[PDB]
Design an enzyme around this catalytic site. Structure first.
Site, mmCIF file in Angstrom:
data_model
loop_
_atom_site.group_PDB
_atom_site.id
_atom_site.type_symbol
_atom_site.label_atom_id
_atom_site.label_comp_id
_atom_site.label_asym_id
_atom_site.label_seq_id
_atom_site.Cartn_x
_atom_site.Cartn_y
_atom_site.Cartn_z
ATOM 1 N N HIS A 86 0.820 -1.212 0.000
ATOM 2 C CA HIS A 86 0.000 0.000 0.000
ATOM 3 C C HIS A 86 0.858 1.268 0.000
ATOM 4 C CE1 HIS A 86 -3.642 -2.382 1.703
ATOM 5 N NE2 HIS A 86 -3.594 -2.414 0.382
ATOM 6 N N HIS B 90 -4.630 -6.557 -10.612
ATOM 7 C CA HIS B 90 -3.435 -5.875 -10.133
ATOM 8 C C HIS B 90 -2.275 -5.997 -11.132
ATOM 9 C CE1 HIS B 90 -4.251 -4.087 -6.267
ATOM 10 N NE2 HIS B 90 -4.822 -5.184 -5.803
#
Length: 380
Positions: free
Chosen positions: A239, A368
């Protein structure tokens, strides 16, 4: 040269094409929507259970593939996906079914995370020509404004119950990250500057304000309903680097002089803390301590990190980031990517061993990894 040219248009397109080929046409449920649980070999191992996150992410898959390859049946699969989204997932109250089995809903809780991906999917619908999506985006944004937007903090809360009556005390960075991303997709698709302004506000609030609350000034996952830090547990490298990417993406749309230094800072710190110097790849999580406290190696962390690295290298021309891009791809090529059947393994242990043969359970559509490749591709 014993590796592919990871920075080449040909390679990136080739890899995306082989990943697409792992999912297509197997994920198509002739009954509606997509199958969402795949074995390494491509087998569907649970054809009934469906999750909003895979329902939307597959829409992203096929839409993006159509936009880049212009293959017609990809647009058909994306539209098939949109139909399932709106007729099965989109319930009564304007909210979306989180989890479902056949004609039964398993979970009707409203997650902000879900809504972000709903907006992302509608953006993609729009860009492949569903004129109506512009309105859908607009509708969903207001659902969020009405129920999730927390103006006094400049953030979105995480979840409300299905009735719309019980708000969770939980606040989390995650929903705001993906929300920021989704709203950039919306701005590209619609050019409505409202969305870009919200994306930049979220970016500021998470990457500056909420980040400052930590020692290392890294983004922590979990916050109280005060948006004070509530001490998975630990900092999540994926993240940090994902945020670096979002900041650089915002810095090209609507520049801001702290974007690049912050991206630079988060990436340097995350990568240095989480890179496994003996066996390769980024670990899943470390303590504010900096101690690695979950050493498993996830696909999305590797992918978001090489996207962030590529952007950083374009932004700075620092060859450090290029080299790190190559390290992340090398680890990925050697351990994450199934070279027989295509697409990425989801997770390895410390020693780069698979835990099992579940390539893609609900949640993973290889959104992703294809997304990361796509954004490097824009820069070429």
């Amino acid at each position: 040269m014993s590796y592919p040219a990871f920075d080449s248009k040909t390679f990136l397109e080739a890899h995306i094409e082989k990943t697409m080929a792992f999912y297509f046409p197997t994920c198509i449920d002739p009954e509606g929507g997509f199958f969402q649980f795949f074995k390494d070999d491509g087998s569907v191992y649970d054809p009934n259970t469906r999750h909003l996150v895979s329902s939307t992410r597959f829409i992203f898959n096929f839409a993006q593939a159509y936009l880049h390859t212009n293959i017609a049946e990809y647009k058909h699969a994306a539209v098939h996906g949109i139909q399932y989204l709106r007729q099965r997932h989109q319930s009564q109250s304007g909210g979306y079914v989180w989890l479902l089995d056949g004609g039964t809903n398993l979970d009707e809780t409203n997650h902000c995370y879900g809504l972000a991906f709903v907006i992302l999917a509608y953006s993609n619908a729009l860009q492949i020509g569903l004129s109506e999506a512009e309105v859908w985006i607009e509708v969903t944004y207001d659902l969020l404004e009405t129920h999730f937007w927390e103006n006094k903090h400049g953030l979105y809360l995480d979840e409300i119950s299905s009735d719309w009556k019980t708000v969770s005390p939980y606040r989390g960075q995650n929903a705001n990250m993906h929300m920021c991303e989704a709203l950039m997709s919306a701005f590209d698709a619609t050019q409505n500057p409202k969305y870009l302004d919200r994306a930049k506000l979220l970016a500021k609030n998470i990457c500056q304000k909420q980040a400052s609350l930590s020692n290392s000034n890294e983004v922590w996952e979990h916050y109280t309903n005060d948006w004070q830090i509530d001490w998975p547990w630990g900092f999540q490298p994926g993240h940090q680097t994902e945020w670096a990417k979002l900041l650089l993406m915002l810095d090209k749309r609507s520049p801001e002089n702290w974007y690049l230094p912050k991206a630079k800072y988060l990436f340097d710190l995350a990568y240095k803390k989480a890179w496994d110097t003996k066996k390769g790849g980024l670990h899943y999580g470390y303590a504010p301590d900096g101690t690695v406290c979950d050493p498993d190696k996830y696909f999305w962390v590797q992918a978001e990190s090489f996207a962030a690295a590529w952007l950083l290298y374009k932004a700075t021309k620092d060859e450090t980031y290029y080299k790190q891009y190559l390290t992340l791809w090398e680890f990925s090529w050697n351990h994450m990517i199934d070279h027989t059947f295509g697409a990425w393994y989801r997770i390895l242990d410390e020693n780069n061993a698979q835990y099992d043969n579940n390539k893609s359970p609900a949640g993973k559509t290889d959104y992703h990894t294809m997304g990361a490749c796509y954004e490097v591709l824009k820069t070429l």
